[PDB]
Amino acid sequence: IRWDVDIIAQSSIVHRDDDTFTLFRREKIIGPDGQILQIPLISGSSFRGVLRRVGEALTAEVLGYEDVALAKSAHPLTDEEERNLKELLPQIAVFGGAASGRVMSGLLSVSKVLPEIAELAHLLPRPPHSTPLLPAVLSVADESPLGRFAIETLPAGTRLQTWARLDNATEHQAAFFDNVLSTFAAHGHLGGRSAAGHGQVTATVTATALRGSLPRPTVDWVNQLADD
Amino acid sequence: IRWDVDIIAQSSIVHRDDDTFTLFRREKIIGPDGQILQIPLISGSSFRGVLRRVGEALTAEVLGYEDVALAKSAHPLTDEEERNLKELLPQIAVFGGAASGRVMSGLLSVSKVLPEIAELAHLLPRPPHSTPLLPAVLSVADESPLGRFAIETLPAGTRLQTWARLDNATEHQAAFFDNVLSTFAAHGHLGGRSAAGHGQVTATVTATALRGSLPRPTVDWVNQLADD
Amino acid sequence: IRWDVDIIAQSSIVHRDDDTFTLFRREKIIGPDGQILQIPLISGSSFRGVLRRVGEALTAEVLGYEDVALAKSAHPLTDEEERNLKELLPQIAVFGGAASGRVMSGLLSVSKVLPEIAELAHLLPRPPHSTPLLPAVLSVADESPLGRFAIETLPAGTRLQTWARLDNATEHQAAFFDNVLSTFAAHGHLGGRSAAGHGQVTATVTATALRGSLPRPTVDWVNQLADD
Amino acid sequence: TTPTPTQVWRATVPELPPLVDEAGDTGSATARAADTAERLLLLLHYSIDWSWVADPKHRKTWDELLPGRVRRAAYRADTLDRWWSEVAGQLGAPAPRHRDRRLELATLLREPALPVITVLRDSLPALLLRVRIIAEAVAAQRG
Amino acid sequence: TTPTPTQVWRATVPELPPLVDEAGDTGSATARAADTAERLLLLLHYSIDWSWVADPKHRKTWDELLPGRVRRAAYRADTLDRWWSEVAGQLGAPAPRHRDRRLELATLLREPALPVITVLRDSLPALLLRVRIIAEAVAAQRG
Amino acid sequence: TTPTPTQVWRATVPELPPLVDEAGDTGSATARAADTAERLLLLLHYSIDWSWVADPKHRKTWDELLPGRVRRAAYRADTLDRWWSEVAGQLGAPAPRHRDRRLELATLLREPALPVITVLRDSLPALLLRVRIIAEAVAAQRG
RNA sequence: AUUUUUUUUUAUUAUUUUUAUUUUUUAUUUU
């Protein structure tokens, strides 16, 4: 099952690159028609990370968080390598991770965003406009010497097109990811200054193109054994 | 909990950009329907800063200010990194800051203002009017050569729509922010020449759409240990 | 029968070589005109492995996978060496393998990919550009110390040219491989970070230059005896 | 047919090719507004005595006070109120005894009339460079 | 025929050979945009008093505030709005009493006008090195 | 005639004989590109304050962050965009008040300009060893 | 009087947190 999402912004979307100095917008290149061009786009891993935070927040609303032991790392303790918990816990089975050195396999594959005028996304909603138009707001000038800052951002009206995909149409994980995308369509955000109103978007989910998930299935109430 | 505020101006709202020369109004762009347009709007960080000043003024009415040691900066002294004071002090827990190099996390996220005719705010109260109408008063001409100045401002009748949000419906901080918005609805202001009557507005707070704060809770009388 | 495929990328194609440190792109050398040069190219075995995974996934949609006993190895048990199953099972007959020490013979031979400007592929679609242009995106910086990573990749607009070949125009295996290439042209991928949108391509299959496969033949419904 | 007296102004400076198009207003909408604004503001410098305060350059009535007064009048709607505010502001004269200028002007005072104010705001001094060049050249051919 | 006053600027520094080509713009399209951008920004430093804030170097009006203001004005479309934003920003002066500079400037304010903004964005300080060198050399020949 | 201020840099370390040839660039084409790359990157370490993050070694501004930033800027074309990306990245300063350095730099920013990027890619740290040695030696003669 | 055959470098990781364009200026006077 793949999900096609169209995302229309409602504010500026600041996405940082990798004395009163500016700091740019992340830009990736394309060779569309024989020449090299730079275009702005949020990296596809940022969307995956936002969905990861949303999924971990949603899986704690029905499971207790009073006890522990996100972005996992690798370290060996005793190499315990039985992984039935993918069936038990529907979060690390979908999005992957690293527990004890042996990294996991994630069913989810998600693509980058493409706001600008190119030929790489799916079908366009409008006749095009020019490419170099990502004009920049000017920042807040701390004013305890008021050091003038300035950031670079997409304008508030740009449309974005993205698709995510789960290949194995097997079990409740499709409904779990549908709930995650419902939350992200309801009150999602992506950007870098969400505490200042930068990054408010409204999305729509469409085009479940393969064998659909059955209505009213279980999300996580599987008696909550709450293992490690 | 999110708070939806409608703000009707009662005077001109001058908000500066970033020999007898003028000085404009801050304008941010939108791509609404395929073309680029410039519209005036107060940046969303200015509203956050005004609320920050209001909150710091309100937290000093019950806590003594005879001793010290706002807009915080970052510098390291010894990197003392225990942060229980978020529970003790309800001001820096909500609005964030930087103490000793490690910046804080702010629960508050607030959006920009949208006065003009667009499609980005919530539901409109009136049939629309034209976009380029932000006519300008002419300034005061010092008259010790009387150098004629001139500023650019919104007219006195423009409505504005804004929403603020605290995500974690946990504790007294919702009531504290409700008190802050009560103060701002009572005698708030936003603009750039409040000493000359520019920026007087009247607001209303509405639409606590999630689990509401219980009536008569404690604001800050938690025995005032008054630590650093 | 040989199949000529032209592959246009739709995203970055990361293909790894063999503290905040980078990690490069695989590069193979050419002596084109008397001097030694390094050019990036995906190894031809990677394409064969991707087609192997696609073929094994496709052969399990019509044959039950509830019982077992891919990348095979060699070990002797009793050296049972009758191999009629090449006619019965159309997967290991085409792509080869090792069952009990005696390795198999694969009819398929597939060539490497050649994206860059050289003289080794078949006919070019465009006037050329410079060679050293494989600029690199910067990675995701884990942010639990946010360790900045960086990978090296081809840009999203590079064309690629490849040919595969089955020599023995005999039986249904040509139609089976045509179905495999149809799947790979539909929703194929090649690269190293397909979970982050890296490696999405669109291909076209052309130029069956020898005795063609007859329309509507049997793929695998040969009564499914399902032997070892 | 008519000389269209705003055309014989622009005809004195062929080193500046026209703004709109080769032979007719096609393919651009803001160019029509810019041309209308330039023609309107050009029929404002030769409509007065240069009757204002007098020094041997008349204080650049040209960037000393003309852009300020035009900008200040450009904060009203739609176009008739704008021209009233300007003509009461700067000097005050309808048109000389040349009925072609008067008829062309009064034809011009109404249009779509929304984007013209935007053109007077978002690009003032380019139009002033244009008007200064045409005025200087047509003055130079009567020296 | 004409001295073309942006040519006599560049003529003072022969140690920097030209950017475009030997004798005419052939074989490159971005070089024309880069040359147009350099000429446009060169006709912006000698168009003002150096009337700004005063210290014995005038605060490098040159990398202290000129690239910031040029960049900030470079986020509008297409070219007339850009020059309005700049001239209202930095100091404010159309051109001195040299009609060759004025006519060359007003000829320049329109072009293809899409790649010029891209040139002002994707390579700012090389053009500033160029303008600083020509300005310093033509100042040095009047010392 | 001129001291050519990138020559008096290399003159402080005679224990490292030159790379190109005995007295002139003959018989090798990649040596010219390597020398141009070394000279360009040498006119990048003495063009800034060492204004960056401060510890008693300034965090090796030298293999801690200089090769990373130079490599990251080396993924653009051709050379002006590269230097813009670098100078906006690392610290930001055109050149000090020494017009010889400025003129030599702005002469250098254009060349064949294709193999220079290849030289910055396929051999980075040898050039960094060179620049570190010359910088350390010319610092040592002012101790 | 072939050293031939078979053998994806691959799973996993938000460039995130913090930040008022602020403070000052009778369109005065003269018939």
Residues 15 to 44 of B: which have CB under 8 A from any A CB? 17-18, 28-36, 43-44
CB A43, CB A70: distance < 8 Å: no
Q: CA-CA distance, F24 to F38, in Å (whole number)? A: 16
Q: Which amino acid is at D87?
A: V
CB A114, CB A131: distance < 8 Å: no
Joined tokens for residue A190: 């992506």
Residues C155, A71: C-beta atoms closer than 8 Å: no
Q: CA-CA distance, A31 to F27, in Å (whole number)? A: 36
CB E49, CB E91: distance < 8 Å: yes
Joined tokens for residue C56: 């094994």
Please return the burial class of E9, using the count of CB atoms within 10 Å of its CB with bins 0-12, 13-18 and 19+. Answer: buried
Q: Point out which residues pair with A40 in neighbouring strands.
A: A27
Q: Point out which residues pair with B150 in neighbouring strands.
A: B138
* Residue in A21, A24, A36 nearest the CB of F92: A21
Q: Which amino acid is at B149?
A: F
CB D82, CB D124: distance < 8 Å: no
Q: Point out which residues pair with C136 in neighbouring strands.
A: none
* Residue in D75, D118, D122 nearest the CB of B135: D75
Q: CA-CA distance, C93 to C83, in Å (whole number)? A: 10
CB burial readout D29-52, b (16+ within 10 A) else e: eebbbbbbbbbbbbbbbbbeeeee
Residues of F in contact with E130 (CB under 8 A): 106
Q: CA-CA distance, A82 to A84, in Å (whole number)? A: 6
Question: Å from A43 (CA) to G10 (C1')?
Answer: 21
Query: CA nearest B181: which of B203, B162, B159, B200?
Result: B203
Q: At A162, which helix (H) or strand (E)?
A: strand A159-166
Residue of chain A whose Cα is closest to the Cα of B72? A144
Under 8 Å CB-to-CB from D28, ≥6 apart: which residues? D20, D21
Length of chain A counted residue by residue: 228
Joined tokens for residue B216: 């008569």
Q: At C8, which helix (H) or strand (E)?
A: strand C2-9
E126 Cβ under 8 Å from any chain F Cβ: yes
Interface A:C, Cβ pairs < 8 A: 67
Residues of B in contact with A135 (CB under 8 A): 29, 36
CB B55, CB B126: distance < 8 Å: no
Q: Which nucleotides of G are covered by protein (CB under 7 A)?
A: 5-28
Cα distances (angstroms) measured from residue A194 to each of A11, A153, B224, C144: 10, 13, 32, 19
Phi, psi at residue C53, to the nearest 5°?
Answer: -65, -40
Q: Point out which residues pair with B30 in neighbouring strands.
A: B37
Joined tokens for residue C86: 């090449």
Q: For residue C116, how many C-alpha atoms fall within 13 Å in the half-sphere facing its CB?
A: 18
Is the CB of residue C87 inside 7 Å of nucleic acid strand G?
A: no
Q: Which amino acid is at E57?
A: K
CB burial readout A94-130, b (16+ within 10 A) else e: bbbbebeeeeeebbbbbbbbbbbbbebbeeeeeeeee
Cα distances (angstroms) measured from residue C147 to each of C21, F61, F97: 9, 19, 38
**Min Cα separation B117/chain A (Å):** 14
Q: Which amino acid is at A13?
A: I
Query: CA nearest C47: which of C153, C163, C143?
Result: C163
Query: CA nearest A149: which of A40, A22, A54, A31?
Result: A22
Peptide bond into D78 cis (omega under 30): yes
Task: State the CB neighbour count (10 A cutoff) for residue C218.
Answer: 11
Q: CA-CA distance, E130 to E143, in Å (whole number)? A: 20
Q: At E128, which helix (H) or strand (E)?
A: helix E125-140
The set of chains that have 3 or more CB pairs under 8 A with E is A, B, D, F
**Min Cα separation E97/chain F (Å):** 31
Residue of chain A whose Cα is closest to the Cα of C142? A71
Q: CA-CA distance, A75 to F6, in Å (whole number)? A: 50
CA D112 to chain centre: 17
Query: CA nearest A190: which of A47, A19, A8?
Result: A47
Q: How was this structure determined?
A: cryo-EM
Residues of A in contact with C197 (CB under 8 A): 44-45, 109-112
Joined tokens for residue C169: 């125009």
CB A155, CB B36: distance < 8 Å: yes
Peptide bond into E78 cis (omega under 30): yes
Q: CA-CA distance, A55 to A106, in Å (whole number)? A: 14
Within F43-143, strands assigned E span none
Q: Point out which residues pair with B109 in neighbouring strands.
A: B165
Nucleotide of closest approach to B104 (CA, C1'): G18
CB E111, CB E34: distance < 8 Å: no
Helix (H, G, I), strand (E, B) or coil at F42: helix
Cα distances (angstroms) measured from residue D15 to each of B211, E1, E106: 72, 14, 10
Residue E25 DSSP one-character state = -
Q: CA-CA distance, E9 to E137, in Å (whole number)? A: 9
Query: What's the reported resolution, in angstroms, to a tenth?
Result: 3.9
Residues A141, B18: C-beta atoms closer than 8 Å: yes
Length of chain F counted residue by residue: 143
CB D9, CB D138: distance < 8 Å: yes
Strands B27-30 and C108-110: what pairing? unpaired
Helices (H) and strands (E) in chain B, counts: 4, 7
Peptide bond into F78 cis (omega under 30): yes
Residues E128, F94: C-beta atoms closer than 8 Å: yes
Please return the burial class of D85, using the count of CB atoms within 10 Å of its CB with bins 0-12, 13-18 and 19+. Answer: middle
Query: CA nearest E115: which of B123, F92, F85, A37?
Result: A37
CB C117, CB C85: distance < 8 Å: no
Phi, psi at residue C203, to the nearest 5°?
Answer: -120, 170
